[PDB]
Structures are given as structure tokens and as C-alpha cells.
Design a protein around this ligand. Sequence first.
Ligand SMILES: Cc1c(-c2ccc(Cc3ccc(OC(F)(F)F)cc3)cc2)[nH]c2cc(Cl)ccc2c1=O
Ligand code: FES
Lengths: 65, 59, 196, 439, 46, 99, 378, 74, 415, 239
Amino acid sequence: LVDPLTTVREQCEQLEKCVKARERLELCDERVSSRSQTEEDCTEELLDFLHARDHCVAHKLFNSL
Amino acid sequence: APTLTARLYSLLFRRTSTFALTIVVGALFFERAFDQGADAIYEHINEGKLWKHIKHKYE
Amino acid sequence: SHTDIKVPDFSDYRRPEVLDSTKSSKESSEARKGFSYLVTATTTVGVAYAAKNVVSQFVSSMSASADVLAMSKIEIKLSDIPEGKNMAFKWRGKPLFVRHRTKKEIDQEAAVEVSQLRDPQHDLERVKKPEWVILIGVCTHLGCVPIANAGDFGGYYCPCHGSHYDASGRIRKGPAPLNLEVPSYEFTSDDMVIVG
Amino acid sequence: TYAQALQSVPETQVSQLDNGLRVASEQSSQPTCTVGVWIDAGSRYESEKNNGAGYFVEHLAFKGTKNRPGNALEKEVESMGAHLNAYSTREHTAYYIKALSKDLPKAVELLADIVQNCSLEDSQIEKERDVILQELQENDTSMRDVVFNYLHATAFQGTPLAQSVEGPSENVRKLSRADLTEYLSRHYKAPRMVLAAAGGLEHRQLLDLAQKHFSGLSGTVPTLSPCRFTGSQICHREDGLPLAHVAIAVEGPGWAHPDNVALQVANAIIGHYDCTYGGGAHLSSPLASIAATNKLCQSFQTFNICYADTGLLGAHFVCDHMSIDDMMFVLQGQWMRLCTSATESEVLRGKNLLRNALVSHLDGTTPVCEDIGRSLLTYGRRIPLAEWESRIAEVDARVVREVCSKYFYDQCPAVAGFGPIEQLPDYNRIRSGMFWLRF
Amino acid sequence: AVPATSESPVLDLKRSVLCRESLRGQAAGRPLVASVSLNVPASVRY
Amino acid sequence: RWLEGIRKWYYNAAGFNKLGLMRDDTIHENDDVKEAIRRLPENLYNDRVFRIKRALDLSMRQQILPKEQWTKYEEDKSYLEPYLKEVIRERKEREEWAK
Amino acid sequence: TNIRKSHPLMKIVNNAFIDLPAPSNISSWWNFGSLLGICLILQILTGLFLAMHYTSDTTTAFSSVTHICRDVNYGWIIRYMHANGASMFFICLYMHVGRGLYYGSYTFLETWNIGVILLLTVMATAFMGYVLPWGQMSFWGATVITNLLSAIPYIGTNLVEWIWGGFSVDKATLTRFFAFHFILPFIIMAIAMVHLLFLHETGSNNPTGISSDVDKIPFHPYYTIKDILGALLLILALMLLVLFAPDLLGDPDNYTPANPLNTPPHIKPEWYFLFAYAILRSIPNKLGGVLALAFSILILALIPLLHTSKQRSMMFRPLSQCLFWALVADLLTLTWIGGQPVEHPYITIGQLASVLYFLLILVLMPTAGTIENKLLKW
Amino acid sequence: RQFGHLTRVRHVITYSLSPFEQRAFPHYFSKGIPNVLRRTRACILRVAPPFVAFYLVYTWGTQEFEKSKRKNPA
Amino acid sequence: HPQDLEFTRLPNGLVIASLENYAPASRIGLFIKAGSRYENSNNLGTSHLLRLASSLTTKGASSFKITRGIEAVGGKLSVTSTRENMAYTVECLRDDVDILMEFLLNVTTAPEFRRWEVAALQPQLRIDKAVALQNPQAHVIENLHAAAYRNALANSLYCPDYRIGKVTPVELHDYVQNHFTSARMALIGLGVSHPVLKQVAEQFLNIRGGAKAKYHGGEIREQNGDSLVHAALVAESAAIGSAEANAFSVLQHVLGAGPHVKRGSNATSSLYQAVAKGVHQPFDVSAFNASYSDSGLFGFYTISQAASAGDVIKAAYNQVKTIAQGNLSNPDVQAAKNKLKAGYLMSVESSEGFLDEVGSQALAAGSYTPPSTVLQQIDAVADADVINAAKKFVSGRKSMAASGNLGHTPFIDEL
Amino acid sequence: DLELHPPSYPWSHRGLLSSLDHTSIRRGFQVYKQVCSSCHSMDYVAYRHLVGVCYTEDEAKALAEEVEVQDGPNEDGEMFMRPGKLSDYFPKPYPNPEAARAANNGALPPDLSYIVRARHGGEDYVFSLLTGYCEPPTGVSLREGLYFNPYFPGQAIGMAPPIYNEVLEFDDGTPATMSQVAKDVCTFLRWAAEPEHDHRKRMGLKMLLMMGLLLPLVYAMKRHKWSVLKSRKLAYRPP
Ligand SMILES: Cc1c(-c2ccc(Cc3ccc(OC(F)(F)F)cc3)cc2)[nH]c2cc(Cl)ccc2c1=O
Ligand code: FES
């Protein structure tokens, strides 16, 4: 039993502004997780990516329900 | 033959009495028709979504 | 001179039916009135539908709410009351006495004197089935909850003032004016009764 | 009795010449008489370019002839004791002479000389021009004349019945002697004309005199279009004048229609009043008694005016600037009450009034002469008194209701108001006043 | 029954005369009469 | 002289002229203007009364007059000035005397 | 001799409602008077029906309101009619006042001033109405707003506690708010009738701001038939909200019961107070801000005294027209800034918007009137 | 004040037509559309300018708030 | 059934004259010697209120029943006053004569003149008078008579202003009881049998009985700033019943007694042509002839422009002077006689004017003179009798009365 | 303290005249009954409320008999326990809030009656919360018991992800994926807070229609009356 959700979250993840935002996320991933002692985190970058991603998912997730 | 609107006036609308009895009798027929009609239009827009449509499945 | 005045042309504003300045307006009069008065008559029939809804709703409001109709009726299972035994219940904030009656109790409350009673009733018109009697559990004089399987006349007895009720619920010896109150009910299935 | 008295009234005699001129005569042993020519001509038969011509001609008519130039025609009538008179309505022009019975031959001669051989002198036109122009100024001061002209104008707007008889000032100032002669030769024709007479005269004699003088009368043809009635208001606001004139009417049936008899009976119930009437409160008409006790109006009369294929049925009133609303209210009320609920006794009264009205009007040889003259033009015959009674006797409370309901009940009237008329009801409020919310 | 030739008001501006054709007839020639009624408006004659 | 340019512009902006009104027709009726109006000669008063009756009827229909029929800036007589000037001059004399 | 002008009762209805001389030309901005009427009747009816079912005890209060919407027959439509009825009231009011200010109807001083009182009374009513549900915003609004009175020197602190009937907004507050909220509409009812009594001393202004005695029409049937059309459109606007978006103009937090520990994120009054709530927060000093919040409404009483123009209406006044339409846009901005959290840039926008509101009324719009006058040689 | 007491008017005629004789919507689109455009053009750049400014101070202020709650690269 | 008038004089004095003509409508008229002349200086304007007072309560019928009763059968009740007589007239259909007759008798023999009803009626004196005085001919002729006489005929037909509100119930009773008597009354009829009229007059009109006019010569002048000037100048003529009176009536029609052709010039009017020679602007002039029992006035009446009043009056006076000197041909007197003869016959043409002439003659004379005998008496007038009437007028003491802007209107002693 | 607001999912009751999917309600109930109703109360929904919506009377009577509830006192004065009936409400997990807090470590689980209406975004929001539970980003970490949800305000919530694939077996045999379980429960929570949803919209249709008729009809009467004044012509005729 595959969840239509985790299928479409993939489909939408391979769009231009998604993969562009998935790269912006990976930049600060190996900026903070490489550096030592600054209290700066990466919540902002994840939320940017999810916004773009989940906008798409909403558009066609309800087809399969 | 005089026009439809003309026959309407002479027969129903001239005496203020017949005018009133008309509106009341008309309102009875309008209520029933309007309700029945509008209820069809709602239940078609919402086909299979209402308890009225899925009642049969548990009886 | 006042003879130099001439009425302006109103053609732009006239109804088609009165443009012809050489023909009588009286033919079209019947019709033109018909049309304008049909608009009023329709409008009224519309608003008559509207106000009947608004009013009829507001009236409905004052009538019993769903949560009060919920408590209106109480279901009782007739296989959970054995022959002789009373069984008490809460109904509309009151006790409610349902009693299985024996072939003995039916015959003994059938041949009683009707006239001797303070409130003359026979038994076959105080219940719908012979073997079942449903009553409110409130004493009619000044309000007490009578005790089952006691008293002089073997049914219900009140230790408040000094009332004695028979098996049918009728006051025999005491101050109570009216007999115990017979609620509205009917039997549904053979096994179940609904009171309310 | 009264019933019998009608049966023995002198009959009216009827004969027709080659050219088509009708001769009509009522005879009674009288030392005096009245004879005249009635003509189907006036303002309704006039176009916009020639309006007022009929009225211009009436002025010239007694100002000389071919046979009797200048003041010859005038002198000859003055010296033999005669009286020479004329009038013009929107539909009828009339010239008639009151004379000694023995002088009837010369009478019928002089009428013929006026009609046919009318000088229409060039100097005499330019004179009578400035005369009509000053009458227009006098007529302007008569609130009654003004408001009624205004009623016609809006009531029959965009037709020839909306035209005044006098014509506009522009037309009186420009009409040439070409237009006047053209007008005459078109409209003044034997089949349009009736010679009527009453007094001490033999019908046979009149018919021969007609031959001798009116034989030259001529026999493309002027046909009256029907006239469109409009539910309208004309309001000439003049807070300068002390009292307000108001004229209101619905479309009436016209000359021929039998309904007119029943309508007269109803106009008789509501009737008429002014501040010099002996009755006051105790008067029979509820409009009259209420007007009187409350001092609503200075005066009022119901009319029923009749043209060919139409008419004006309503009322005029004159009143204080603060009374217009209340007068309009009580009058409209009376209309409605007759339409819905007229009583037998109050219709018997109206019947009696009308029986009395037209039997006393026909008193003297002049009003009887005019009845013959115009009846022939409007009805095509004199209607005997006995017949008028049979039509009045027919009317009951049922009739007055049904006839009134036709013309009054839920129908769009014509309104004319002049003077301090701020109060004068709004047309919608007036129109709403033409039905009840019960019947 | 029949109304009078002229309806009579109080305080209403009178009708004007501007020519000798409309003025003629008015000059009085016989003594005044006065009439009042029930039906017909009050009048005064020559 | 130099503000006459703006005066002419404002006049047509304001645009009471489009309803066939002059400036003095639009003045707010205080106790002084009432009196000034009451002192007007027949002709001036009845003209004011038509002009306004003509504007209110136009306002009722949400319309204007033809441009050929609009009040010209140059042809806008100040008809109320002399009556109102005095009425005010008079009042300020009675106010002065009262003190 | 009719019985419309005779009967002592009918006479009043005939003279105020049928034969009233009315300007030919009054526009749609004159329809807001009779619409305010309809709102007042509507609130009182729906209101009385809710009071047959509601209770003012802090324990059952919230529960009774949800009982109406769930268990009372058509209780829901009645309840959301009454809440969106209060919105439609305030829309009407601000539109009715705008008409006053633009066409200079305030010159009728008595009629105007009674107005200002009616506006303050409807405000007091609605404020106390929005507490009765005893949700979060209901309770947390009522506390912050009431507790502004504490800023008054000497007495302020006592005053707040006296209103409350305790040391916080609790059982004694909610029961008395239910009493004041019931009575006041009937006191508005009476004051509204003095409002009209004074109006018929001059009758109506009209869009030209020129006298209209030369062109009056009878109220019936002209303005009766048009009042009906207006009432019809007011019902549409109300029922669109009630039947398609009954929660659009409210706040979610008033669906969770009142909790004196747990505070809602951004506490704010209902949309028709936000303009004044923003002006309050403009001034950093708390007593100052209460004098500004008070003066933002009471300045209505000062508007007649600030009238400079020799023309009464803004019809023929272009400068004033713009500045007026600026005041309307600035009020729309104070409403937005009212419903925002206190941070950059909303602190500086709110300050500038507040300065401009008071600047427009006391200086700019009076100056504009004068400049216009000297441009017309006046 | 009553009708008949409002003010003094002289020499002004009014002609008018019964509503039962005339149309309720004479040239309603024909003459209506242009009259609307005229009325709209007349008032537009008195009414519209302030609401433009509101829109610009609104969108500017909204996505200044967003930016200001993001993190600064330092 | 060819029908000519019947006549009866009862021993108590009363006259009954009635022609049964079988017409549908029936006129009846009670003529009384109760004119304005019979008022003294104490009860002025009583006859004027008495003329308005028909329809006040009587003994037989209420004020209400008189109005409703009459209107019911489509009828009418009219009162007519001259300076010498009063005439109560009733019209109806011939079936309702005895209903109107009952009302006539009640009104004339037994009115109650109730205090409250008579006080309520007072204001109607003012309304009536106001309306009547809109005619400038009412001003001048009322004034003329007041200027010309010392007593009886000098009385106005309209109540003086100082008496409006003050004509008492007693003054009404006294005026009726003294003047409405069998010896002073003549009951006339059309469309009703003579025998039944006679019987009603015997049983319901048998009521027991109850100085001469001194000519003065004066002038009264109503200055009022009209653009026109109304003016009348007369001298003492002859009394009606005398043969001389017929001379004045011919002289009137020689000089010109009002118009014959609509919108005309009056080519056979001596006066109009005499005036029109010298002045062409708006004007009108006619001979004035009033003839009473005791006396009479003959002259002319001028309507002229304010500034031309001097010219028109003198022009018109000059025209009577040449008629008096002897400038008068048979063709003039013949044309004049024809006008007068035609005038009389036309004035008894209608049933209304006939009733007036039968009643009128019945009071001033013993009985009825037929229309043939009257034409014969106009013929009897010799050209010399006309020239005498004129001569009498030129040398007679003059009375004058004016209304208008009189700045150019002469006095009597400027003429 | 940034914020990620939910996207607007195309619900079967999105549109103006769109009713609730009642079969979707019948599923959503079960997701409260099996999953939520051991932590969250729902104190304004009774077993009688389900009748004529997602269950029959006989079905609802069974669902009610299936749970305990206190009653009394009886004649002895003792508070007993009995099986439920229709008149009974949905039972509270704990006897008070103070108990509830203990059971979840300090955090009180809200009552769900009105939770759709009481939160910005409604069913959009709740769906985004339930499905949107993800692994924290680099630099982040909350107290042992407070999980990471990007849709919750302040990015940290004290609720364990409550749904996953096949968390229950549906009575109509729908494949019980995480997303399907979240879709159905949100649909029920909507009806929970706004029972009037379907009646309201039926009225909405009938109001729009009746107005569509009455507005131009009344507007025509208005123009008819005023017609007298709109058409009138003025004239100025000084001497
Ligand atoms: C009463 C009144 C109205 C008017 C006011 C309200 C309505 C609807 C209404 C009527 C009454 C009501 O209750 C109340 F009486 F107020 F308490 C509530 C609502 C209809 C008309 N409109 C006008 C408009 C002009 Cl221009 C002038 C005077 C008036 C004018 O005196
Ligand atoms: S209450 Fe027990 S019988 Fe009186």
C-alpha cells in the first residue's frame, strides 16, 4: 500500500522552483553542519521549499481520494 | 381577441378583491413549485453526497 | 398669448402602443395596465413566500428544542419486569412505575365497584393491554413517591398524609382527589414499550 | 300629466336640397323667430399652418358682402329690428339671426349673403388682425379660459383637438387673404351645412327660401382622424394670482354614444356649486354640502364635453391656495362612490334634474334653433323630448355604477392647473385616487 | 337645475378689456335687477 | 492678473455652470443671504428661482446641459453682491451700537 | 376632510412618512437613514429571540450560545443574522456620516449633535454585545479596553473596579453587561425619534447644498418605493454574509471559551473599532492615547465649527472632494494598521496615518475651503 | 411646513406623462452607458488617487514585514 | 286646444293670471310690492337680507326639507328684487307643481326667521354684495339713483356696509307682515289650470293689508384710478303707465340702446356715431331709460379713456341737443320704432320673460295688455313727442354719477 | 518565528452550493472514535447528532450502548455507571483539564468540537498539520517530548504524529492511507463545528434565486413610479 501523498510529494519535488529551493536548503545544510559555534539554524530554507512543494501537492492530491 | 395582459386585468386585477384572492392562490402554487424545483437543483449539484442519496445502503 | 404654448413631443418616452397619434389609446389601455399590475402582483407573491419562511421559522424557535425532544420519550424493555414486580424509572424529572400484573390482579381489579371509588374509572380503559399498567410515581394530593407492594388495597401506599392505591392505581382510602396519572404511550414490538 | 305633455310637443321638419344642404324647422304661432346656418368646421379641421382661420373669418363675416359692401349689411339688420350673432367651437362654426316672423324671407337672404359673398376686404383684414391680437391679451386674464385651453392641449396632445380655436399669435399676425378664401372653399360645403329655423314660420316656405339663396353652395374630402387621449398634467405655476384654477378629466365616449345619457345623470348627482348658492350644508350633493360647510372651494362644475370620436368627462374647481388637495380628495371620492355604490333614490334625483335641465333649456326660439342646427350635425337628426325621457327612465342604480366604472374606475386622467398651485396633488397621488382597495 | 353663464368667486382678479369690439354692450340702458337662488349663481342685470 | 489663469480653470472644475447656475445661486443661505434674497426685484428673483429649479431637476436625472448652454465664466453676473454687501454693512452697525 | 390629517395618531405618521415635502433630487446616500432604522428593528427582534435561550452566568454562557446554534430551531440563522446584523449596522452608520460630511448636512446642528450621541450609544451597545458569548477575544478585549480608564489620575483605578464589580472581568461584569446591552437599544430607539423630530424643523439637505423649496416631491409614493428597494438590497448584503460567509468579519479565537491564563496571540476589537484602536496605539503615553481615542470620535462635534466654505456641499468644490476622499482612504488605512501586530513598519505607518486623520480635519480641509472661496472672489 | 407654504414661484410651466402611458426603461443601455462613462470620467481622479496610494502603502508595508522577519546574511 | 291667458282679481285685491299651455315644465311666480324703495333710513338693507333668506326654516317646512324636497324633484327656487317689487319664482315638471307650491307659500306667508339662523346668514350679505360690485355698472347706477332722489328710489338693492351684521329677526318679520299682503300681491302661472290656482290663492294667500319719490338732482363721484371712466348723466323723465313714457322709449332707440351685430360699429346709433367722429380709441355709449310708478330717469351712459371722459360726455350731450332742436327724420323714428317693437316681442318670446311681463303689468297696472295693443301704442308716438322728450332732458335738472380716474371727468356745472 | 500558512485543498464542500460528503463524514467519525477519543474531548456532539447525517437511529443507538457513562443518584444515594443511549454526549477522556495535562506532560489537548472554526485555515490547516509532520532541519532541537511541525505556530508542537498508513480499518473498506485518514477526519471536524453547513447552502440557493426575481421586479416598479418626474419638461415664460 503506497500513499498517493508520498508519490505526489515526489512528482512535484522535480519542478524548477522546488529543485532550486532544494539547493538553497542544501547550501545552509553544509554551511552550519560544516562550521562550529554560531547559533544560526535553517528553518527559513525548509519552509521556503515546503511552501513551493505543498502548493503543487494540494492542486492534484485530492484526485486519488 | 384582446392580449394576454388584457384578459389578466379584466378577469383578475380590476376589482381589488379578485386582485388579492389571486395573489394568495398564486402564492400557494408558487411556494410548492419553487421549493420542489430549487430542491431538485440543490440535490443534483450535490448528487450522491447527501444522506438522502446514501440512505438505502443501511436499510 | 397662452395659445402660443404647445405641449412638447414625448415620443422617446411613450410606450410603443400609444405612439400612433391618429388612433385611440383605449384599445391598449386594458393591456398596458395588465403588464404594470402583473409586476406588482408577482412581486407580492414572491414577498409572501419570503415572509412566510421568516415568520414560520421565528415561531418554530419558541417550540421545543432537539435536546428537550431527546428526553421527551423513554424506551422500556418488557422482558426486564417479571409478573407481579413493579420497576421504577426517571421520566421528565419524575419517577415512572411500570408493573407486570398477574391473572389474579387482572380479575381482582376487573370486578371492583366503580361507584364506591372517589374517581370512578373501570380498569379496561385505564390501560391498553390487560397485563401491563404504566403510571407516573407522583402522589396526586401534595406530591410524594408511593412505595410498591404495600398498603391496605395491595398496590401502592403513601407515608406522607395517608393514601391507599389499589393494583390498577385508583385511590381507594385516603385524602388524594384524583387517581395516579396515566401517561400517553403505545406498545411498539411485542417486547418493547415507548412512553411519551 | 308630464308623460302625455311630451307626446304633444311640436315635431321638427327635415328636407334636403340638390347640393345636399339640410333644411330643419320647428313651427309654433310666434310673432318672432330665429334662423341660422350651422357648419361642421372649427379648429379640429384646421392644420398647424392655418390654425385660427375659422376664428379670423367669424370677425370679417359681418363686415360687408359683394351685394352689401361695408356697413350696408350692418345697417339693414339694425333698421328692421333684427339681431345678428355668430360663434365658433373646435368642431362647429355658426351664424344666426333673430328677426320678426314676417321678415324671415329677408332674414334667410342676409344669412346667405354673409356665408357665400363675404367681401374679405384688404384694409378690413389688417384692421381685424390687431383686434384678434388684443382679444388674445384679454383671454390671457381669464384663468377659466386659460386652464380649459390647457386641458385640451395636454389631453389631446399632438393632435388637432389640442389646438385652440383662436390660434397662436404668430398665425393671426401672418394669415393672408389667400389662406382665408382657401379655408372657406374647402370646409363651407352644402353637405357639411344645415339651415335651421324656429318660431312662427311654415317649413314649406323655409325650404323654398333656401332654394332661392343657398342653391349656389358647392357639394380630397376633409375626413376627421380620431384623436389620441394622453394621461398627462400641465402645471402653470403663478403665485401672483390670488385663487387657483384646476381642470381634471378622463376620456369620454363622444357625440353618438348612448352612455352619454347615464353619464349626464351622474354629473347631475355631483352637480355644481358656488359661494352664492342658497342651500349650503343642506344641499343634496355631498361634494356641494362639504365644500360649503368647510369653505374648500369658491365654485365647481362637472361637465362631460363631447367631440366626434372622443370627449372630456370630469370637473373644474376654483379655490384657496391651501384647499386644492382637499377639494381633489372629496371629488375623486364622489367618482369612486358612484362607480362602486350608487343608491336608487340618489339616481332618481339625478334623473329628475336632467329631465328638468333640458326641458327648460329649450325655452325661446334661439336655444330651440341651435338644438336643430347642431343635432343634425352631431347625431344626424333632432332627438325628440319623448325619446330623451325613454333613455333617462331606462337608467337605474345598476346602470350609473356600470357606466361610471367604465370611464372613471382605474383610468389615467388629464390634469390642468393654473395660479397658486403648490398644493395641487402629484399626478401619482391623483392617479392612485382613481381606485379603491375594497371593491 | 342648469348652472349660470358665469361662476362667481370672491377675491379673484377680474377679466381685462383692451379693444372697442369687446367693450361695446356693457353700457347700462334699463334699471338694475338682482337675483339669488338655490341652484343658479347670484347675478345683477341692466 | 496672474492668478486669473487658475480662477478660470477652477470655475470649470467646480462645474456648477454645467447645470446652468451662476456662483451667487450656490451661496449657502445664512440669515444675511435670506434677507438679501428677500430684497431682490421681481425679475432677478424669478430668474434665480428657475435657474435652481433647472439645476435640481438635472441633479435628479444625474445629467448636465449641452456645452453651448453652460454659464460662461465672463457672463457670470455677481447679481447678489450689492444687496448682501448692504445687509451685512447694516448688521455690523447695529452690533457696533449695542456696545 | 380625510382621516389621515385628522386622527391624532395618523396625523404624526401622515406628516412624517407620507405628505412630508422631500427634495426632488436626494441621492442613494439619503437611503442610509431608513436602513439604520431597519438594522435597529432587526437587532431588537433577533436579539429578543436569543435572550429567550441565553444565560449570563460565566459557567453556562458560552455553552448557551452554542446550544442556540446546535439545538434551538433555526437558532443558528437568528444568531449569525444578529452578528452580521451588527456589521451591516456599522457599514450603514459610517456611510450615513460620510454623506453628512461631504454634503455639509451637519449645518443642521441639533439633528447632527443627536447623531453623534446615537453613534456613541450604538458603539457602547455593540462593545458589550461582543462580550456576551464569553469567548477569548470577548474577555481579553473587554479587559484591555475597560482597563484604559485606569490611566485617569486620582480616580481611574477605582472607576475600572466599580464598572467590573470586582478585581477582574468576571461573573458580576458579564451579568450587568447583559442588562446594559438589553436596555440601551430601547434608549437609542427614543433618541433616534428626537433626531427626526429636529430634522423636520428644516426637512432634508440635497446633493447641491442649495435650498430645494422650489422643487419638493411628496415622500409617498416616490421615496417609499425607493426605501423598499434599499431595504431589499440591505437584506441581500446581510443574507449573502449569513448564508455564504457568516464568520468572514469575525475572529476564530471567539470559538474557544474564555481563559484568564492562556492569552490569544494578537488581541484586537471588532473591525468597526480598529480605526480608533490604531490611533490609541499611535501615542506611546497611555493616558495621552485614551484622550486621542476619545477625541477621534468627539471631533465629530467640532466639524460644524471648522466649516469655512461659502458653498455648503462639496459638489462644486474639487480641492475639498480630494482631501475628503483622502480622509476616507486614510481611515481604510487606520483599520488595516489596527488589525496588525505592533512592529516595523506598522508602528510608523499607524503614527503617520493618525497624524494625517487629525491634520486633514483641523487644518487642511478648513484651509481648502478658504482657498476655494478666494478663487471664486468671495 | 405644509405643501402650499414652502416658497414663492412665478411663471414656470411643467408638462408630464402618466406612468401607464410611458416606458420604465427608455433607451436604458443606448443612453445609459454613455451617461455612466461621463459620470465616472468626471469624478475618477478625485476618488481613485487616494485608494491607489492606500494599495501601494499596503503592499509595500506587507512584504516589508515578511522580509524583516527573514534572517540577515551576517 | 288654442289657449289664451285667463285673469282674476279677488275682492281682497290679489291678482291671479294663468295660461294653461300643456307644456312639460310649470313656472309659478308670486309678485309683491316689497322693493328696496319701501325701506326707511332705520331698516336699510332689510330687503337685501330678505332676498337671501328664502330656505331659512318656515312653520310648514324645515330649512333642510325646503332644500332636499326641491332638489329631489329636480326643481329650483329664485327670489328677484327691483327697486319697486319682489318676485319669488319656482320651476319644476308639471307633476310636482303642488310640491313646489307648498314650499312657495311656506317661504312667503310663514317664515320663522329664527335668531340663530338669521345671525348665521349675516355674512352672506357681504359675499353677495362683493360679487355684485365687481361690475362697475352696479357702482354707477346705485350711485346715480342715490344722487337723483331724496327718498324711496334713492334706496340701493344691496345692504349698506354699516348694516351688515345688524339686520335683526324683528326687522325681517316687520318687513314681511307690512308688505307681503293680498292688496300688494299678484300670483302668476304657466302650465297649471286657473281654477285650482284661484282656490289656493283664496285659502293660503288671503292675508290682511299693511310717500312718493322726491327727485333732487345731485352728483356722486367714485375716484378709484381705473384707466377707463364709467359715467351716467340723466334728467327726470316720465312714469310708467303714462303715454309720455312711450316717447322716451322711442327717443332711447333713436339715440342708440345697445348693439345688434356682433363686433360691429353701430351704423344706425345716433350717439355712438356722434362720439366716434371725435375720438377713435376704445369706448362705448348708450341711452339710459329707467321708468318707475312715481317717476323715471332718462339720459345716456359713457365708458371712455380717463383723459377723454371730458370729450365723450360732451359729444353725447350735443347729440341729444340737436334731437331736441328738431334734427329728426321719419326714417330715423321708423327704424327706432322697429327696434323697440322687435325688442318687446323678443323679451316675451321665452316662457321666463312672459311670466315677468304678466306679473310686472299685474302690479303696476290693473290687468294684462296684449302684445298687439302695445305695438299700436308705440306707433301712436308722433315725431313731435320724441323732440319734446329730448327738449325735457336738455332743460331738466340733471343727476350724474362717475367711477374711474375722474381727473378729466367734468362736474354737472361744467357741461 | 517565521510562519508557513496552509495551501487551499480542493474540498468536495469548497464551492458556494457544495454540500458535505456524508460518506466521508461517516469515515471521519471513526477516525475520532478509534484515534482521537482517548486524548481529545468533543463535548458538544451527542450520539443522537449522528442520526440522519452519517448513521441511522438503530446504528447510533449501538455506538452509544458501546461506551460507559455515570448517572444517578439512585434511592440509596450512590452514583452508578450505565451503558449509553442517544441522549448522552461523546464522553471526555479525563475527569478534568488538570488530569489531562499530567497524561500528555503539561500540554492540554484542546476540545475538538469547534477546532475547525477556532483555527485560521480550518480543515486546510488541520490536514496540513496531520500530514505535514517531518524531521527537523539542521541547527534545531526541542525538549524531549515536543515534536517538529512546520505548520504549527513557533514550529514546535507537543503532539505525537497521530495518524500513519492503516491506523484503522474503515467500515466501507477504503484503503486507509495517511492522507485519506486526514481528509476524512477533517471532513467530520467541519460538520462537528458547523452542522448547519448543508441547510445554510440550500437556503443560499433559494435566496439568490428569489432575490434574482424580486430585485429587477421592485426596480421596475420604482422606475414606473418615478417615470412621471424623469420625463417631465420645464418652461420659463416671464411677461
Ligand atoms: C421617517 C422618515 C424617513 C424614513 C425613516 C425610516 C424608514 C424605515 C423605518 C421607519 C421607522 C422606523 O422606526 C422608527 F420610527 F424610526 F423608530 C425604522 C425604520 C422609512 C422612512 N425618511 C425620510 C426621508 C426624508 Cl428626505 C425626509 C424625512 C424622512 C422621515 O421623516
Ligand atoms: S401527599 Fe401523600 S396523600 Fe397527601
